[PDB]
């Protein structure tokens, strides 16, 4: 049964048009249902933007009436969002979804995974990645804690993993902070003293907007 996948650019300039595509598989967008776009702003508020029905009929949130267009290509089983004249307030995570057109039979709303779109005039920039190893005068415990500082990138997001995802527990990544049109975050991993540096520990940093992947080995300070 049905699957929905949002795709499109992660960064749009103010005053340009934001475009996204939802690729639907397992169900034909012409048979039934309404094919929807919603969004979630930073701060978590949610908004329904509109839909195109299985019949080709649109319904648009009145708050967006001038700027939005939802179209479809029935031969590709896709539907599309266009939002014109964006400003920075259009920065949000955009979801596609399916809802019931008719009241009966009763249908459950079903949402895609969401894709972040930043509206900004700032330039795409890849992160610099720095190791966080303890001062060589620092104390070995039972557990040691290391990390990676991911600095000076734009826009969001970045994903960081450790030893390619093998190290999962004892791991957490802090939300990024924005300064001067650039983001910084770090990530922490905690493993047994007995296993580092004998076992090697590497943070893997991926920044999709710049198509960048970097791996940094954490080496003890001497």
């Amino acid at each position: 049964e049905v699957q929905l996948q949002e795709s499109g650019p992660g960064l749009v300039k103010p005053s340009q048009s934001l475009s996204l595509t939802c690729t639907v598989t397992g169900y034909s967008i012409t048979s039934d249902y309404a094919w929807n776009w919603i969004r979630q702003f930073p701060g978590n508020k949610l908004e329904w933007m509109g839909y195109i029905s299985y019949s080709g009929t649109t319904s648009y949130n009145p708050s967006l009436k001038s700027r939005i267009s939802i179209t479809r290509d029935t031969s590709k089983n896709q539907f599309f969002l266009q939002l014109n004249s964006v400003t920075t307030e259009d920065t949000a995570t955009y979801y596609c979804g399916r809802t019931g057109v008719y009241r009966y039979p009763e249908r459950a709303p079903y949402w895609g995974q969401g894709t972040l779109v930043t509206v900004s005039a700032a330039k795409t920039t890849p992160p610099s990645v720095y190791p966080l190893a303890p001062g060589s005068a620092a104390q070995t415990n039972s557990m040691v804690t290391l990390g990676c500082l991911v600095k000076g990138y734009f826009p969001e997001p970045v994903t960081v993993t450790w030893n390619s995802g093998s190290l999962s527990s004892g791991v957490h990544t802090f939300p990024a902070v924005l300064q001067s049109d650039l983001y910084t975050l770090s990530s922490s991993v905690t493993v047994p003293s007995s296993t580092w540096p004998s076992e090697t520990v590497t943070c893997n940093v991926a920044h999709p907007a710049s198509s960048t992947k970097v791996d940094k080995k954490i080496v003890p300070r001497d």
């Binding site: 709303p109 949402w111 995974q113 303890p134 001062g135 005068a137 600095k151 802090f174 905690t190």
Partner: protein, 213 residues
């Protein structure tokens, strides 16, 4: 437009406990109401449709009731993996509208932070910048204070802080504090200290390094 108001805005509940949250609509919405869940860092997921119809794959402990303008969601036997934000959406009239969200966090035994300080890497120093990072990991409750001292002197500006959401395994919080200076200012001082004050101790947790060791 139909206004959807959720209450409470925020809450804490014990593991195993029965939790209820409410959604109120500005006018009758004929039970065309859905409940969505968003676990921290993750995507929106629909749990309930038409007020009380559970989505397949959703556990029995979740249940929706209400009619007219007044709707509720109930978790029985709260579990760790139920933390996150819950939203109520009306699909009765255009435009479809959502509630502002109720955040559900897990109550647990207090925990002191595990504090780590890290000096700048030589890679970063080669570029003229110097960030000193401190992790305050796996503490509860969420409220905490961190103080930086450079050669003993408290530093306020140049410092950026960031908190995680509750960890989904141990329900603890974590925070990181980063002091960014120029290479030149960094190398004008010997001692860098990160101090964590938490209700778990009258005395703060002090971590430190000196450039001359």
């Amino acid at each position: 437009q139909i206004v959807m108001t959720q209450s409470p805005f925020s809450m804490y509940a014990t593991l195993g406990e029965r939790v209820t949250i409410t959604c109120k609509a500005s006018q009758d919405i004929y039970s065309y109401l859905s409940w969505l869940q968003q676990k921290p860092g993750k995507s929106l997921k629909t749990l309930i449709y038409r007020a009380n119809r559970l989505i397949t794959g959703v556990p029995s402990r979740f249940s929706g009731s209400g009619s007219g303008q007044d709707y509720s969601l109930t978790i029985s036997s709260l579990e760790y993996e139920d933390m996150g934000i819950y939203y109520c959406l009306q699909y009765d009239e255009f435009p479809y509208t959502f509630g502002g969200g109720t955040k559900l966090e897990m109550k647990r035994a207090d925990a002191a932070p595990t504090v780590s300080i890290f000096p700048p890497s030589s890679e970063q120093l080669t570029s003229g910048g110097a960030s000193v990072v401190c992790f305050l990991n796996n503490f509860y409750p969420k409220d905490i204070n961190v103080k930086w001292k450079i050669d003993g002197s408290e530093r306020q500006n140049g410092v950026l802080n960031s908190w995680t959401d509750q960890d989904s395994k141990d329900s603890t919080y974590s925070m990181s504090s980063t002091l960014t200076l120029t290479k030149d200012e960094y190398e004008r001082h010997n001692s860098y200290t990160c101090e964590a004050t938490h209700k778990t101790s009258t005395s703060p947790i002090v971590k430190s390094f000196n450039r001359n060791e």
